[PDB]
Design a protein around this ligand. Structure first.
Ligand SMILES: [Cl-]
Ligand SMILES: [Cl-]
Ligand SMILES: [Cl-]
Ligand SMILES: [Cl-]
Ligand SMILES: [Cl-]
Ligand SMILES: [Cl-]
Ligand SMILES: [Cl-]
Lengths: 183, 192, 186, 186, 180, 179, 188, 182, 186, 187, 187
């Protein structure tokens, strides 16, 4: 159940959106990406200076859909804080690592996986074709290298491997900036 | 999930429509076309002078449905800016290239495919027969030639091939006018 | 997705406020009943102001199509017909049925006047009714009157699998004008 | 059925949320976790000092989803009171034991199970989720937290979370999973 | 069909008058909803009586105990009214109402048979046998009716149907409602 | 389709005028809804009459008895109006309306046959043990003025009655004449 | 999987056991099950009217009407019908177990027997017409009377026990009179 | 896929049945139990002296259905050799431990779990209710104590725990007699 | 489709089984494993000396099911030749590498992937067993023994998404020879 | 419907009876089940007679590259010559298998339709794992190289043509080098 | 229901007719139907290359590609293929009826013949890939040319008629040139 809040009736997610909070709590597909892109564009229109908070609990998904969110985060004027709760895998971790520098977080028991799987599924027919022709893996690897400070050689080895990181190991890797302290 | 916004309660897409923004974020079929056409007609009725912003993240779809959107864009008085976020393939890239001259954009990591397949999604038999009439393909090729500045010979070869273009390659092709560069903070101090 | 507009209406409801009806699907009884109700409602609001019927339809039921046709002819306001995309079977019949001088098509629209004998899902009695030879003769007679073509020519053409461009539909007499883009108007 | 309350129309759960009450009445998956996390974040934004009441009737679920709720409870400023009504098993009993010290309760006939099943409990976790649990040794972390929150040794917790054991509300209090068994108020 | 009332759906409008309808099988969703309604009615007024109407074939022991415990926990008196049927956990909840405020309509059917359970989760079933919840049910029914534990044990193990009058004589209800 | 009324759905708007529509098979959901509507109308006004329109093929004896008992329990008079059909528990509820206030439209069909067996297994079990058939027959005897012997024979037979035949039987007080 | 047995003659496992006068009643009792069991019983009598028949029971019960069709066929035919409970015999399954030939009603050591005859048709096994038939013809009283005769218990005791949710071990079922022997392992 | 063998056409399992081999390769339910019991009864009828080979790859299942197989194995005259290939969990390990003494085997990479879960799902309610009579759990524990030679106290603790054993650990436990060597 | 062969009617797979050929042409689950194990046991019973041919076209599957086939190959007396046609991934490549020494083959265009994914072909119980019994370490040790590569190299490669040509698999030690087409040289 | 044939007792279905005459019909989309069945039929026919020709009839819209390569490799591995006959259509992997028949023994009926376009994905006929290997192992380049060798066209021409949506008549396929002869109605 | 025939060997009704060189095309024409009919035609030629084959037709038609596969097989094989319309021959079914051996194309008195070749994949029996082949390779023009040659009608008349919804009796089909004779009841 998703409850209602009256200030004017909003659902829980709508009420959080009023406080510049966006929840990315599922697999990344085109519908999810279009919704997140629209919420990011809307928050910038409301206030171009105030920070945005993107909570991440995602097993990942479509590279195309993830790149649409990634590009929107980088395009907009507001700083987008990324907070991992639960899990950030595949495009999920890519989006976590893509938050404003110094504003990338994860709760103590959060699990981070940088493995970028070969195919999709979710990604469509046309989507998988572009990934390999346009060498989008190399683009993902290059961006991860820039955002973590790790060499491209190290990123290439790690994105190709099934590896799970704790929030502390993710911080040491350069994916997040701080492990959220109970306060 | 599609959230609610209270100014009066709208969903996220309805709230963006208030700012003259349309999202074409799926395969193009008759339902999608009818909704987009209706949104374009509605925005013209509100203000016939103010620009419209059409965001595109589409794998393409029906030629007939895609031509209904194309014809509506060209029929209406306002300029329709096109912005590719994610992907524009088949009718998707045709609609991207159909935006107002100087106002066709793509985000840096967007993927553009001009291949017009020979359809795919669920549609009616007559529409499928119409989608494959050889005259419409020549019509698509002629419009793409006019909108990109490329020769019809080059367009014919490229729409028949499985080709993926980066946002920069799409700009060099003439399918977009600019690759969107991130918005720099505090660029106008004397006014703002 | 069908968005919301607050002045709360959905996109189609907001267009209905401006006397615009969208016939964007196959024609069945539910579609016909909805279109008939929208036409009756618009007449009740203003019996003088024109109505705009946008068509993007592969056609459908003859009975359902005749219910829309009869409502268009019965009401006092002029019903303009605008083909966007496609108008086939009962869809092209309804396009040709718009107010004289007010039947349009966008440049890339596709028109098919073929009235299939076979076909769409209707009830047993309705399928039997859609197959009465007398009703095909009435369709042909109305198309002859509305296009200015002979009944002999209409009989041959509604029996054939033929696709027409917007310009060819204008030359045929199914539409009165091909709508020209706003970029070309001085 | 979930009834409506007018003060402004809320459903039963929305009306309880106004009084800082959250109901965790199902299996724990990502959708449930995201909803509970959002409700916790919302209540902190309203008032960072006032207590929150988390009612639990759950057979458990995903370790990852459960840890997202656990981490949010510990992160926020308000004290989160935990009240077991009915059942708290697997991640449900872990969340019950995670409430503010001195503010963990259970109704007299509530059933508490600390058994943490090997996989994703009753098929509540994805392949990606279960894979992380044994690489990141999340079982050892669950056991360490339960040891700290109950006051039991890690050796005892390890033995008990591996066993199919059901506890009454009184046995849960003696274990250190709750602070008090709620007595009928007069 | 559930109609709308403008001053709500029919159940929401009755909730305004402190009336709760338990008209289905008892599962976790039903129990969580009833518990929430009871907690809400106590928050509104801790002194005014609550009316719980019962037409239920029973259900989950765990879900039923959640409702039972909430009734006993709250300050207001919870009146129980059987309309139609009260079987298994339904008859247990009917006997659980405030003393002197347990009722049934003349043609209501009451079954105290607590089956061995027909949906309840594997984990729920496992709990009931380990925690001997059947013995607890019997002990509470015995206290609520005034019957011996031996008589309750025999009767909750048997397939028996009682009229409203027989249920009053048993002690599961206090009065058979007379047409007003 | 169920339309909207602005001063509600069609049934909600009729409920405002103290009208209840029993237009389907009688099961627990139907019974709980009808019982709740009856309780709500009594709370609004305990003196004003209630109108129960019936178009039902019948259903569950347990669910039907819940409606029957609520009609008899409440203070307002419940008028019963058969439109279309009243069979099994439906005809039982029609005969249960306030004395002098039981009606049927001219072309309504009434069947008093109470079939042997939609009801759950637990419900069917109850009916046989508690001899609910005898109770139904006794109530029908009291409400029609027919002997229990006649009712027993007729509820066991497949018999259809016109609105006029139902009036002659004592199931209804008047056949509503076009007025 | 149900395997094949070749003796230029191919049978499935159940068909091969039928050749040795063995019938498997391994499911809920409905009309299709009853008609199949009745047909197998009639066929075995036609083959040899003197040789014993072995009915294996692993059943949660079912339809009273379907169960009575099997019961009546067992009593009608000339061969003695031995009943063997493997696993479970509840409701009509335990009624059929108790209906086996005198001295020839068996259970494996870990079998579970329930004599409870549920009010309806043991979990949607009987139709509306079947349920109607049972109460008019007072079939419950007939079941109780037959169980009283076959176990040696009083009708008063049977009435109380068929109305209760009770599970019996193979040894408790022997002491009750529902079976005659708890099967002994064969060695060498 | 299940292929055909002509000697007379059999499927793969029918051809193995000719050599006194039974495959228990799935979850244990009533249909599985009735089929295995029938195969065991058939093989005894063919030859009451020759050994039977029961191959096990099972995650377990119904206690009632499993006890029907167990009782049949113990009732019949032939020795029933049990061979775990892959997995033997819950009723599957119980049936593995039930084979003739000195004739219970497991392949090197086989996984054995003696945990007997509390509950059950396709089964009937009565069967489900029977599967959790506290008395059957005590009987399972007593039989496991006798078949392995471990104390009842040790069995009670281990059947209540989520424990996985290698083929060698299961031999050490007394559930099998030998780990089959390549 | 699967055609019939009369010598006595067999399907295509049954007729190949007569020539000691087994086809592993799908994902590996318990049903597949039980069928392959049964076929291997049957062929040994027919002739304990004659070689068996196991053709592999599989994307892999369950570790437990794959180990059941692996253990049966090692247990039986006949040499089991392995031939990859198409693909051998996950447990499929493990079984390819498990064939008799000098008798492991792949067709020139066969694709081999040694990546052993962390997890959806396995049951709840099957996944649980794998991380408790450290089956991944056992798989890695066997691959190290059968390829002649170090344990550390195998650990790195089974954790990576890597595709190998038939020639690269031969160089790796996963097969002994790439089967060459008939060299027709006039 | 697939009828039964009795030779005399011995009952075959239509495809089984054709298999007795060394005929294989590839009349559907190419997936792993289709490939495994065709591979098994090819292996069986070689075991029967390693010298006599095999006839592979093709009416296929194509399918999985992995499944198609399994058939291709089996054709090249076995001793008998595999004649390829296009009836109806040969698209994607179907046209690849048609071009892969024994030299001088690749045919098409006059109204057969050949498409050499090798679509990017699979489409929809291949799994994630299957699609993944395609790009890593550059199977497209291998397909193009084999088509270049079997037709006699340059790799540059093949690369352009397999990337395009092109349909060829039986005669155009012969001129291209995908077949050796167009079958003319026989006397 | 499809019954069994035992010759004293068990065949179904269609298998027993196949023994007498009879093929029944009694459904919509798709790839599975075409592959089965092609296989039956190839099988009958293998049995006897001289004896006539009888193709009974009761079909609403279907796929152009699937229909062309049957058409090409009929023309390729050595035996004469007699065509007999029972019930209906529409779309590809009427093209196949007209394709039978000259002098050996028949229809029963009450059979209905429709030569209309619908634009798409005629009753959605054709795939997107199939529909693509037809418009590019101008298969409609090839159909019309063959039909013109087989009936003796002008190409203009055939073009007009295969584009229209038209129905013919057995006698009208004979006069059109689509069949050679209307079958007269056997004496
Ligand atoms: Cl674990
Ligand atoms: Cl009290
Ligand atoms: Cl219990
Ligand atoms: Cl022993
Ligand atoms: Cl693992
Ligand atoms: Cl590719
Ligand atoms: Cl065409």
């Amino acid at each position: 159940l998703i409850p209602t809040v009256i200030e004017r009736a909003y659902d829980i997610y709508s009420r959080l959106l009023k406080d510049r909070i966006i929840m990315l709590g599922s697999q990344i597909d085109d519908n999810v990406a279009n919704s997140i892109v629209s919420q990011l564009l809307f928050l910038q229109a409301q206030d171009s200076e105030k920070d945005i908070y993107l909570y991440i609990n995602s097993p990942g998904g479509s590279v195309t859909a993830g790149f649409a969110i990634y590009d929107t985060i980088q395009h907009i004027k507001p700083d987008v804080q990324t907070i991992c709760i639960g899990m950030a895998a595949s495009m999920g971790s890519f989006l976590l690592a893509a938050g404003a520098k110094g504003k990338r977080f994860a709760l103590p028991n959060a699990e981070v996986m940088i493995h970028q799987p070969l195919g999709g599924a979710q990604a469509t027919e046309i989507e998988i074709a572009a990934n390999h022709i346009l060498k989008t893996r190399e683009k993902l690897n290059r961006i991860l290298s820039e955002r973590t400070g790790q060499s491209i050689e190290k990123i290439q080895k790690d994105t190709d491997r099934d590896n799970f990181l704790t929030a502390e190991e993710a911080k040491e890797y350069g994916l997040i900036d701080e492990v959220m302290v109970p306060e």
